Design a protein around this motif. Structure first.
Motif, PDB file in Angstrom:
ATOM      1  N   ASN A   1       0.532  83.248  22.292  1.00 51.62           N
ATOM      2  CA  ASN A   1       1.969  83.526  22.378  1.00 51.62           C
ATOM      3  C   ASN A   1       2.828  82.549  21.553  1.00 51.62           C
ATOM      4  O   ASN A   1       3.508  81.681  22.109  1.00 51.62           O
ATOM      5  CB  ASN A   1       2.434  83.546  23.833  1.00 51.62           C
ATOM      6  CG  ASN A   1       3.850  84.048  23.976  1.00 51.62           C
ATOM      7  OD1 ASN A   1       4.269  84.984  23.275  1.00 51.62           O
ATOM      8  ND2 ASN A   1       4.630  83.431  24.867  1.00 51.62           N
TER       9      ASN A   1
ATOM     10  N   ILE B   1       5.130  82.326  17.453  1.00 52.51           N
ATOM     11  CA  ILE B   1       5.533  82.925  16.188  1.00 52.51           C
ATOM     12  C   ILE B   1       4.686  82.198  15.129  1.00 52.51           C
ATOM     13  O   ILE B   1       3.976  82.839  14.348  1.00 52.51           O
ATOM     14  CB  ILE B   1       7.055  82.778  15.943  1.00 52.51           C
ATOM     15  CG1 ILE B   1       7.880  83.478  17.045  1.00 52.51           C
ATOM     16  CG2 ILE B   1       7.434  83.293  14.561  1.00 52.51           C
ATOM     17  CD1 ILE B   1       7.767  85.015  17.151  1.00 52.51           C
TER      18      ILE B   1
ATOM     19  N   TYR C   1       6.088  96.881  22.140  1.00 55.00           N
ATOM     20  CA  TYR C   1       6.377  95.487  21.772  1.00 55.00           C
ATOM     21  C   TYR C   1       7.072  95.439  20.404  1.00 55.00           C
ATOM     22  O   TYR C   1       6.646  96.123  19.472  1.00 55.00           O
ATOM     23  CB  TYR C   1       5.114  94.613  21.784  1.00 55.00           C
ATOM     24  CG  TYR C   1       5.332  93.207  21.250  1.00 55.00           C
ATOM     25  CD1 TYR C   1       5.928  92.227  22.033  1.00 55.00           C
ATOM     26  CD2 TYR C   1       4.891  92.845  19.987  1.00 55.00           C
ATOM     27  CE1 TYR C   1       6.103  90.928  21.561  1.00 55.00           C
ATOM     28  CE2 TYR C   1       5.059  91.550  19.503  1.00 55.00           C
ATOM     29  CZ  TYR C   1       5.659  90.589  20.298  1.00 55.00           C
ATOM     30  OH  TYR C   1       5.848  89.309  19.822  1.00 55.00           O
TER      31      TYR C   1
HETATM   32  C1  LIG Z   1      16.004  92.392  26.635  1.00 53.89           C
HETATM   33  C2  LIG Z   1      15.093  91.185  27.024  1.00 53.89           C
HETATM   34  C3  LIG Z   1      14.378  90.485  25.833  1.00 53.89           C
HETATM   35  C4  LIG Z   1      15.026  89.154  25.416  1.00 53.89           C
HETATM   36  O1  LIG Z   1      14.517  88.675  24.185  1.00 53.89           O
HETATM   37  N1  LIG Z   1      14.367  91.375  24.690  1.00 53.89           N
HETATM   38  C5  LIG Z   1      13.184  91.413  23.826  1.00 53.89           C
HETATM   39  N2  LIG Z   1      12.445  90.950  22.819  1.00 53.89           N
HETATM   40  C6  LIG Z   1      11.375  91.611  22.445  1.00 53.89           C
HETATM   41  N3  LIG Z   1      10.448  91.353  21.356  1.00 53.89           N
HETATM   42  C7  LIG Z   1      10.983  90.449  20.324  1.00 53.89           C
HETATM   43  C8  LIG Z   1      10.475  89.043  20.687  1.00 53.89           C
HETATM   44  C9  LIG Z   1      11.319  87.999  21.023  1.00 53.89           C
HETATM   45  C10 LIG Z   1      10.758  86.779  21.376  1.00 53.89           C
HETATM   46  C11 LIG Z   1       9.369  86.609  21.376  1.00 53.89           C
HETATM   47  C12 LIG Z   1       8.775  85.379  21.726  1.00 53.89           C
HETATM   48  C13 LIG Z   1       7.516  85.021  21.221  1.00 53.89           C
HETATM   49  C14 LIG Z   1       6.949  83.844  21.566  1.00 53.89           C
HETATM   50  C15 LIG Z   1       7.599  83.020  22.427  1.00 53.89           C
HETATM   51  C16 LIG Z   1       8.849  83.367  22.934  1.00 53.89           C
HETATM   52  N4  LIG Z   1       9.419  84.544  22.585  1.00 53.89           N
HETATM   53  C17 LIG Z   1       8.544  87.688  21.087  1.00 53.89           C
HETATM   54  C18 LIG Z   1       9.101  88.893  20.729  1.00 53.89           C
HETATM   55  C19 LIG Z   1      10.967  92.802  23.064  1.00 53.89           C
HETATM   56  N5  LIG Z   1       9.940  93.665  22.891  1.00 53.89           N
HETATM   57  C20 LIG Z   1      10.046  94.644  23.806  1.00 53.89           C
HETATM   58  N6  LIG Z   1      11.145  94.417  24.534  1.00 53.89           N
HETATM   59  C21 LIG Z   1      11.580  95.294  25.635  1.00 53.89           C
HETATM   60  C22 LIG Z   1      13.102  95.189  25.902  1.00 53.89           C
HETATM   61  C23 LIG Z   1      10.843  94.840  26.901  1.00 53.89           C
HETATM   62  C24 LIG Z   1      11.705  93.267  24.089  1.00 53.89           C
HETATM   63  N7  LIG Z   1      12.815  92.570  24.465  1.00 53.89           N
END
Ligand SMILES: CC[C@H](CO)Nc1nc(NCc2ccc(-c3ccccn3)cc2)c2ncn(C(C)C)c2n1
Lengths: 826, 248, 333
Positions: A593, A595, C101
């Protein structure tokens, strides 16, 4: 609830800018050098340079220009900070009392704007009628230099050309004209506009636009009787002045990028040029006196003088003496002579000023078992590559070890009485097919040498066809003796292989101390690397033997010895390898987990992971399960530069916007969600770019518990060569020191009348928050340098509580002894 | 993609309640009792006609997957109305539904709610959501009845009597498994067909095709008259048992 | 079957880690153990809650199973915690909403200053955001919570609108009394700041206008701590709300209470002069004060800026990384 102190141990040594004029008095020739937040003032003498005053600002110095307005007997200074604080200063001495008066001040930030790619550009009109600032794309701000304009009020004139490369004010014009090189889909072009203050808008430029070279980097305003401008490129220098046009493409300039210029003669006949290779040329403007009386420019000529440090900015003082202000390596005073020496060089190095340059990595070691320690840094880049051994003394002793190539990572191996240093040298593509080095360096001049004979990537069937003259990096692992600093061995890595991480340690039940390197296969085609190696070497009997190699599917950005195991980060993954009895690494567990997991630091079974964009994460190895577990994450997007664990609950991180922050474990078991949230509790705009965090100190620590109650010590290296220190404070100690800062600000008169609270306030292009949980140690240590009456003003009516002691209104002797105690930490 | 929520009349002879020893007449009685309970609770609470119908639909659908012997009809009814409130954006606190439930039910009837009435209902929400397969979006005959009647053009008074009477038949069809057999578009057309036959109205005359006898096809295609007659017959059997005949 | 939801268990997903703290529960990145697909799971905890299942999760379920569009997030299914003891009363589990995702959120990309958007990138992004929004508005749904952190963007260059936890239906026929406190303060329209409770879908268009200007500046255009300070920023740029430009402003409750410092004239075109004419006109129309005079989602798609943007040519917005900034120096200065 985090309480930390941060003080500067070594001021930023890198030169960012330097101007000459008549600032202190109309007679004295001055040289002002801005080293990030500091400003040095010197008086030019026949011997060399004589220092006369040095001041600090509450801002990063972005623009610095001297100018003599109508009616002034001597020059006035103009400065603009990165946070957009503009100010016009004046030097004024009364016998011994040296002061920097703030004649005019104000913040010139616009409500809405896009910051420009080539950065802030600040230029002043030759007649001193306005200060032209290019802060945002498509907008040109104008501060009219008027008698009544004390607040520095300005207006933006709309600019049609969005992407501007560089702009200058032209000489010899009936109206104030700007000349600039800009970029658009059709390529690069040079254009001119007249700036009407009366009408508050641009008017038709005096001469037509012209299509210029693709890499036209700099504009040079030529003084009378020539006028016009010179445009420096990669392969050509061209002169434009309406009907007149000259263009020279000398082959010498093409082999390295010209990065800076300066005017030698006031009439504009001779000009100095400096390129990335240190090479210093003279661009001579050949005159032709017409029968009219006017003197037209017949031709342009370039002549190579010699080699100097890789200049950031050149500024000749007088006679053959030039001040080479270098940001990568040591700055110099060099004598240009009319006659070339036996080597054919017209330059002679006079004096060298130490520049710890970009401190890319460092380690604290005790070379003489003293209990104080020494900091060996990886400083500089390119021919300026070097190691610096800094030790405390009341001046810092610094010994330089020139490598003549870029150092990347350092680490110490006590078992072998030596250091391991990763380094990169540039070789260019030659007619033989292979590549050839520009000069010999640490890796080529090793006593014993080797080349990796791995067949892991095999044929690769990868179309990598390369043209002549293209640069390529060549990565090596250098083994340098801890006393003589002699290059004992150099191991060159695979072609197109970059060494990114290095550790020295024993693993598993193996008694040998290995040097392990993490690499990446870097091809221009790849957006992110898809192959890499973790190579285990052993240094014994003057030669490095390859013990084992483990292939990986990405770049190995960072590695750490984790309880006898090897913890490494491959692109988005954080892996933990075990060292088998078969002398081979075998994976145990992964955490995906991320980036891009760039930085790793461990404390016991805890691991702090510094991500590219998702701030920091606290992982933990669960021994009972043989895997990782996410303890808590910081849900603030922060582009990291370096991370460090202060203690079990507090974690310090440094950001790309020159900021520092500390997160702590929530420690509230009401819910499982809040426990997983890492709260940013400390925030502080450092003003520097931290490349490395390192636990340790250079202060002589005695056999018992001694020095200040500030517990813990973390040194840090920055891009400008500044070395700082971070330490933790008790709650009572912090509240006392915080009240001291508020009292200190009310009496300390700032340069440019810049608010201290504003300067240290945490800042990114999007958010700007006030600094919390951090004490500016430099402001606290300045209490000792103020007058006695101002000291007694600061201590007046000062109460402290819950430190196991009464109210006790602090007095001058109480704080003088407490501040002197805090200066003993570095 | 979406679950099928329709069954044949023949299938209703094999509901869990039926096969647990309960006879057909009794399961039909519990469905009217449960529906009228949801209706009267939510009417007293001042809820929208769609929120009441949504709750009744969830209730009817629930006793397709469960037995009345195992789940007390009134506790399930309170739960349906509670969830339906949140679904239709007309939410009501559970305490208020319980308070109204005890007001309309006797001591024996309210015994179903146990010692903690709120807990009995809240706890059942997990099963209700799982039973309805999280298919929360529900369409009712009302909206269709209004859409089709809006397209009729004729004597405002006669058209109004048809709409008003057909609306009443929708409220009665809530007490029946008709919701579990036919789509709301079909039921909306069926109640218009029934209201028309009682009023002696030629609905085709008010449509965009006054010459087209099977008027209903311009609102719902592929609906044979015999399906409308079966829905009509089932609605009239509610009035045949007792009084209320077929007024105005 | 595939239609049957809530029956399948969460243990059939291998959790990768927590990615964010949601409205009602945490959000985790996970991989389907059977298909290997990556999914995002929103945890819905109902055991610690009063009034059981949260209305915010009900809205998001009811609305997203009804909305199917390329630029609107997909809810794949719902799964539950391991059932036990055979008693639903003792069962204090939690449901998880399975989603597609996405690789990033506009917030993280702009905050870490790791992206740059050219005119063609902004065109591609906005045509997707407006197409997605126009689908919702045509189905009579207000998003009511548009913000940077709610616009997901994967590496393909695809945009998907998400977090329908605050979304509600809208009945144009007659008027329905809604909630005055909607959207984060930076993206909130003037009508809501001035106390409108019977508002239109034009509120979402204001949020998208705030986003449009922001893609050209790399910074939210209006940033204030309070409603009055926010209305002052909006007034400095758009002009002070007054009956001359917004006749029905006199009908709002806080019109006389919330008055800006001065009667500002509109300076939006002046201030954003560095933006291409086609986009500047779109921004001018989207940030129109009177919501009855502000453009619709459909109108933004039939604008000189977006109408001609090719659907097929996605143009992925380059996120420079690895070789970028890890060792800048004079080569990258
Ligand atoms: C709305 C709540 C949330 C807040 O960021 N939104 C966000 N980001 C996503 N994906 C983009 C993303 C953002 C951050 C990370 C991430 C990765 C590593 C560590 C921390 N954060 C991974 C993917 C994502 N995918 C699917 N959904 C649905 C809504 C369930 C996502 N909702």
């Amino acid at each position: 609830m985090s309480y930390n102190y941060v003080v500067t141990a070594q001021k930023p040594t890198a030169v960012n800018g330097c101007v000459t004029g008549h600032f202190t008095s109309a007679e004295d020739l001055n040289l002002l050098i801005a080293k990030n937040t500091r400003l040095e003032i010197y008086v030019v003498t026949a011997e060399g340079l004589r220092p006369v005053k040095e001041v600090g600002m509450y801002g990063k110095i972005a623009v610095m220009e001297l100018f003599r307005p109508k009616g002034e007997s001597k020059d006035l200074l103009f400065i603009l900070t990165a946070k957009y604080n503009a100010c016009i200063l004046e030097y004024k001495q009364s016998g011994e009392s040296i002061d920097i008066i703030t004649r005019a001040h104000g913040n010139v930030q616009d409500r809405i704007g896009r910051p420009s790619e080539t950065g802030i550009i600040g230029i002043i009109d030759p007649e001193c009628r306005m200060i032209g600032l290019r802060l945002y794309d498509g907008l040109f701000k104008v501060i009219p230099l008027d008698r009544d304009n004390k607040e520095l009020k300005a207006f933006n004139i709309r600019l049609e050309e969005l992407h501007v490369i560089d702009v200058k004010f032209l000489y010899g014009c009936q109206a104030p004209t700007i000349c600039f090189v800009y970029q658009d889909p059709q390529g690069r072009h040079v254009k001119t506009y007249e700036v009407s203050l009366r009408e508050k808008e641009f008017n038709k430029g005096p001469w037509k636009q012209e299509n210029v070279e693709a890499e036209a980097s700099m504009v040079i305003a030529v003084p009378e009787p020539f006028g016009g401008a010179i445009i420096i490129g990669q392969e050509s220098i061209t002169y434009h002045n309406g009907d007149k046009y000259l263009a020279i493409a000398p082959p010498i300039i093409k082999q390295s990028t010209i990065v800076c210029h300066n005017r030698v003669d006031p009439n504009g006949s001779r000009y100095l040029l400096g390129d990335m290779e240190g090479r210093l040329f003279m661009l001579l403007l050949e005159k032709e006196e017409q029968m009219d009386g006017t003197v037209t420019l017949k031709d342009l000529r370039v002549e190579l003088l010699g080699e100097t440090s890789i200049a950031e900015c050149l500024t000749y003082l007088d006679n053959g003496v030039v001040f080479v202000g270098s940001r990568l390596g040591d700055s110099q005073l060099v004598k240009l002579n009319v006659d070339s020496n036996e080597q054919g060089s017209y330059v002679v190095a006079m004096e060298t000023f130490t520049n710890l340059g970009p401190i890319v990595d460092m380690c604290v070691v005790d070379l003489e078992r003293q209990g104080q320690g020494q900091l060996v840094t990886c400083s500089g880049a390119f021919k300026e590559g070097s190691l610096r051994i800094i030790r405390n003394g009341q001046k810092l002793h610094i010994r330089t070890v020139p490598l003549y190539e870029s150092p990347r990572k350092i680490c110490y191996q006590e078992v072998s009485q030596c250091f391991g240093v990763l380094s990169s040298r540039i070789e260019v593509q030659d007619t033989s097919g292979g590549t050839t080095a520009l000069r010999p360096s640490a890796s080529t001049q090793a006593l014993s040498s080797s080349v990796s004979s791995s067949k892991l990537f095999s044929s690769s069937t990868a179309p990598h066809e390369t043209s002549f003259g293209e640069e390529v990096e060549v990565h090596n692992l250098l083994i340098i003796d801890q006393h003589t600093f002699e290059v004992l061995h150099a191991h060159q890595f695979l072609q197109n292989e970059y060494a990114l991480s290095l550790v020295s340690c024993k693993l598993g039940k193996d008694p040998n101390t290995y040097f392990i390197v993490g690499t990446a296969m870097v091809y221009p085609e790849e957006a992110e690397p898809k192959q890499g190696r973790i190579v285990v070497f052993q240094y014994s009997d003057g030669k490095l033997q390859t013990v084992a190699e483990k292939e990986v599917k990405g770049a190995v950005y960072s590695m750490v010895e984790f309880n006898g195991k090897l913890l490494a980060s491959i692109n988005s993954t954080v892996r933990l390898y075990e060292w088998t009895t078969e002398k081979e690494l075998r994976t145990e567990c992964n955490h995906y987990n991320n980036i891009m997991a760039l930085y790793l630091k461990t404390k016991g079974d805890f691991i702090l992971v510094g991500d590219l964009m998702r701030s920091v994460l606290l992982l933990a190895y669960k021994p009972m399960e043989g895997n990782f577990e996410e303890i808590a994450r910081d849900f603030n997007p922060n582009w990291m530069s370096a991370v460090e664990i202060l203690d079990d609950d507090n974690f310090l991180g440094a950001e790309n916007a020159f900021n520092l922050f500390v997160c702590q474990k929530d420690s509230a078991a009401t819910t499982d969600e809040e426990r997983q949230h890492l709260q940013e509790v400390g925030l502080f705009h450092l003003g520097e770019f931290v490349n490395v965090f390192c636990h340790g100190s250079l202060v002589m620590q005695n056999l018992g518990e001694t020095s200040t109650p500030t517990q813990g010590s973390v040194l840090f290296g920055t891009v400008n060569g500044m070395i700082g220190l971070v330490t933790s404070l008790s709650e009572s100690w912090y509240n006392l020191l915080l009240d001291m800062q508020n009292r200190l600000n009310k009496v300390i008169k700032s340069v440019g009348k810049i608010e201290h609270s504003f300067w240290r306030s945490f800042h990114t292009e999007r958010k700007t928050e006030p600094a919390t949980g951090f004490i500016d140690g430099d402001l606290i240590e300045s209490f000792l340098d103020i007058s006695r009456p101002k000291m007694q003003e600061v201590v007046a009516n000062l109460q402290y509580d819950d430190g196991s002691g009464m109210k006790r209104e602090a007095t001058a002797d109480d704080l003088i002894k407490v501040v002197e105690e805090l200066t003993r930490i570095h | 993609t979406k679950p099928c929520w329709y069954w044949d009349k023949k299938d209703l002879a094999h509901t869990p309640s039926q096969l647990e020893g309960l006879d057909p007449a009794t399961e039909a009685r519990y469905r009217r009792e449960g529906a009228r309970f949801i209706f009267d609770v939510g009417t007293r609470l001042g809820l929208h006609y769609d929120t009441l119908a949504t709750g009744i639909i969830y209730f009817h659908r629930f006793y397709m997957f469960h037995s009345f012997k195992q789940f007390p009809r009134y506790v399930t009814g309170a739960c349906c109305l509670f969830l339906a409130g949140k679904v239709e954006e007309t939410p009501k606190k559970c305490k208020d539904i319980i308070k109204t439930a005890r007001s309309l039910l006797n001591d024996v009837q309210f015994g179903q709610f146990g010692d903690d009435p709120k807990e009995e209902v809240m706890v059942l929400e997990r099963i209700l959501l799982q039973t309805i397969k999280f298919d929360l979006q529900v369409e009712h005959p009302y909206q269709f009845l209004l859409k089709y009647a809006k397209q009729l053009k004729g004597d405002k008074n006669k058209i109004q009597k048809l709409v008003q009477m057909a609306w009443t038949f929708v409220n009665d069809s809530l007490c029946t498994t008709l919701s579990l057999q036919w789509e709301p578009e079909i039921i909306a057309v069926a109640v218009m067909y029934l209201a028309g036959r009682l009023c002696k109205f030629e609905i085709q005359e008010w449509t965009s095709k006054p010459m087209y006898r099977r008027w209903w096809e311009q609102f719902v295609q592929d609906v044979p008259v015999d399906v409308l007659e079966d829905i009509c017959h089932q609605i009239l059997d509610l009035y045949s048992q007792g009084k209320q005949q077929m007024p105005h | 079957t595939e239609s049957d939801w809530g029956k399948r268990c969460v243990d059939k997903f291998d959790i990768i880690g927590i990615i964010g703290e949601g409205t009602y529960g945490q959000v985790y990145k996970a991989k389907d153990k059977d298909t290997g697909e990556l999914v995002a799971l929103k945890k819905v905890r109902l055991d610690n809650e009063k009034e059981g299942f949260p209305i915010t999760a009900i809205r998001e379920i009811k609305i997203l199973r009804q909305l199917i569009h390329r630029s609107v997030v997909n809810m794949k299914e719902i799964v539950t915690d391991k059932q036990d003891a055979l008693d639903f009363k003792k069962d204090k589990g939690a449901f998880y909403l399975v989603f597609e995702y996405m690789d990033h959120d506009l917030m993280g990309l702009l905050e870490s200053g790791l992206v740059h958007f050219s005119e063609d990138h902004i065109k591609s992004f906005m045509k997707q955001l407006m197409e997605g929004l126009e689908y919702c508005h045509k189905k009579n749904f207000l998003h009511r919570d548009i913000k940077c952190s709610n616009i997901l963007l994967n590496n393909s260059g695809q945009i998907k609108l998400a977090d329908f936890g605050l979304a509600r239906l809208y009945n144009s026929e007659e008027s329905r009394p809604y909630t005055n406190k909607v959207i984060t303060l930076w993206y909130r329209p003037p009508e809501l700041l001035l106390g409108e409770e019977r508002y239109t879908p034009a509120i979402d268009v204001w949020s998208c206008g705030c986003i449009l200007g922001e893609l050209f500046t790399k910074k939210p255009i209006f940033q204030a701590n309070l409603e009055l300070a926010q209305l002052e920023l909006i007034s400095r740029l758009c002009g002070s709300p007054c009956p001359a430009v917004w006749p029905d402003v006199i009908r709002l409750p806080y019109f006389n209470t919330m008055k800006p410092k001065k009667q500002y004239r509109r300076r939006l075109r002046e201030e954003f002069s560095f933006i291409p004419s086609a986009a500047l006109d779109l921004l001018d129309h989207m940030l129109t004060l009177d919501p009855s005079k502000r453009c619709t989602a459909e109108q933004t798609l039939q604008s000189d800026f977006l109408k001609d943007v090719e659907l097929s040519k996605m143009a992925p917005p380059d996120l420079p990384h690895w070789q970028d900034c890890h060792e800048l120096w004079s080569k990258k200065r």
